[PDB]
């Protein structure tokens, strides 16, 4: 005499628990993960230009540590520094090392242009057995160790104008000998002085004589400094001893380049997002792998999982 018509909805044997405004755990028929928490463990070589430093820090490649000169004129989107890197040249330090590393890394290039500096009255191309280049003693490829010629060290006063339309990065240094004998035997004068200036900036460094911890046979040091010369400005170098001169300038650029510390191997694959743990997919909006990232990346969050419900309440 009749019939029954029932309305209903689907269900599944086992759904997924999600959180809502009112519930920390409520079961829905389906959900999807919003947090990327896994990585292949490898850095993909595409689409970004990856430069593996292997045994070299960015600063050692910049200065021209001989075993790092394979990186001359190199470029990168991401420079990868390995924990196995080591220095093998003259022992040095960089005041504000972090800033120099940062600005070179962001520039993205080690493009070096040699310039014809005239060092009248001094001996050029000083070398050291702490920095062997081949079988013989050597020095940083981008620096010029100036010492006395004969029995005198004159007041060096040289200039280099920037007639180009880009910024020039000059890396230079100051030699701190360990003994007064060393100081006078190298630069005659008992107290050196190095002044590097542009129209709008100036730096004057006085070397400091004294023993430092023994490093690769040496208790002397070199201190590295840098000077940016803008288009239309002029570099002037004025020293009466202890100058570690530049051989030219690095070409400054602006762009998407950076640097990363990671021991993850590089592989031939595609991935927009790199972390020190490896490349990760960027389909999810969040990630828990590493707060250090490069590229188009999910935002880092503390949660290791966040389920977005993609189905109704599951009522089996």
């Amino acid at each position: 005499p009749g019939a029954t018509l029932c309305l209903g909805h689907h269900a599944v044997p086992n759904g997924t628990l999600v959180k809502t405004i009112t519930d920390d755990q409520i079961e829905v028929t389906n959900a999807t993960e919003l947090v990327q928490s896994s990585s292949t463990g490898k850095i993909c070589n595409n689409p970004h230009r990856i430069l593996d430093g292997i045994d070299c820090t960015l600063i050692d490649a910049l200065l021209g540590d001989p075993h790092c000169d394979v990186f001359q004129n190199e470029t990168w989107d991401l420079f990868v520094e390995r924990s196995k890197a080591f220095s093998n040249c003259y022992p040095y330090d960089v005041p504000d090392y972090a800033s120099l590393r940062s600005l070179v890394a962001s520039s993205g290039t080690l493009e070096f242009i040699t310039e014809g500096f005239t060092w009248t009255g001094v001996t050029q191309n000083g070398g050291s057995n702490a920095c062997k280049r081949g079988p013989g003693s050597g020095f940083f490829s981008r620096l010029n160790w100036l010492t006395k010629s004969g029995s005198t060290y004159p007041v060096l006063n040289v200039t280099m104008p920037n007639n180009d339309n880009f910024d020039k990065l000059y890396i230079w240094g100051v030699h701190h000998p360990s003994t007064n004998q060393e100081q006078t035997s190298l630069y005659v004068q008992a107290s050196g002085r190095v002044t590097v200036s542009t129209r709008r900036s100036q730096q004057t460094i006085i070397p400091n004589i004294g023993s430092r911890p023994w490093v690769r046979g040496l208790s002397s040091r070199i201190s590295i400094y840098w000077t940016i010369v803008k288009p239309g400005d002029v570099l002037v170098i004025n020293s009466n001893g202890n100058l570690i001169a530049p051989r030219g300038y690095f070409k400054m650029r602006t762009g998407k380049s950076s640097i990363m510390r990671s021991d993850a191997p590089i592989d031939t694959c595609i991935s927009e997002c790199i972390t020190p743990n490896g490349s990760i997919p960027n389909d999810k909006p969040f990630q828990n792998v590493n707060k250090i990232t490069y590229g188009a990346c999910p935002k880092y969050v503390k949660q290791n999982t966040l389920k977005l419900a993609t189905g109704m309440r599951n009522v089996p």
Binding site: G2, T4, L7, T29, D77, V315
Partner: protein
């Protein structure tokens, strides 16, 4: 849910409904049957896909940022760097937690709402020829063969054809 259909007056879901999210089951003299309602299923699926696409819209592309791990003790500037990164992470973690909570609440509610809408639409179709049994089922007070059931499901049911028989069976 806000509308009281799913996990409400619909006592439970159908694990046997594998071809739709919502649908009809019927028993008449010709037997029993089941059919998915494509329109409500697609309404729910379209809303959930749109919400999902909005959630995964953009990966932000950053390149050179600040350092976030440190091997030496430095003090003030490193304190500021760490505090900035901590603050950013806490704020974004909050955003993610709240986003998922709001989205999931709204998803449950809209799926519940689509169920209720289908129920309501069917009752309005049936007019005075049926009664709401209070459990998501309609008692139809006239002979309703498979073609009549299909006419209900596809929106072409003419209630006037059956109104006299139905009214006599009801009252």
């Amino acid at each position: 849910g806000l509308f009281g259909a799913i996990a409400g007056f619909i006592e439970n879901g159908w694990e046997g409904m594998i071809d739709g999210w919502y649908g009809f089951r019927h028993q008449n003299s010709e037997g029993t049957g089941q059919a998915a309602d494509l329109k409500s299923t697609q309404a729910a699926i379209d809303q959930i896909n749109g919400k999902l696409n909005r959630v995964i819209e953009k990966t932000n592309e950053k390149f050179h940022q600040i350092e976030k791990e440190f091997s030496e003790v430095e003090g003030r500037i490193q304190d500021l760097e760490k505090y900035v990164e901590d603050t950013k992470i806490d704020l974004w973690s909050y955003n993610a937690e709240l986003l998922v909570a709001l989205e999931n609440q709204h998803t449950i509610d809209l799926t519940d709402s689509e169920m209720n809408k289908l129920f309501e639409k069917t009752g309005r179709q049936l007019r005075e020829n049926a009664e709401d049994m209070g459990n998501g089922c309609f008692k139809i007070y006239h002979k309703c063969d498979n073609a009549c059931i299909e006419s209900i499901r596809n929106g072409t049911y003419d209630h006037d054809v059956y109104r006299d028989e139905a009214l006599n069976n009801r009252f």
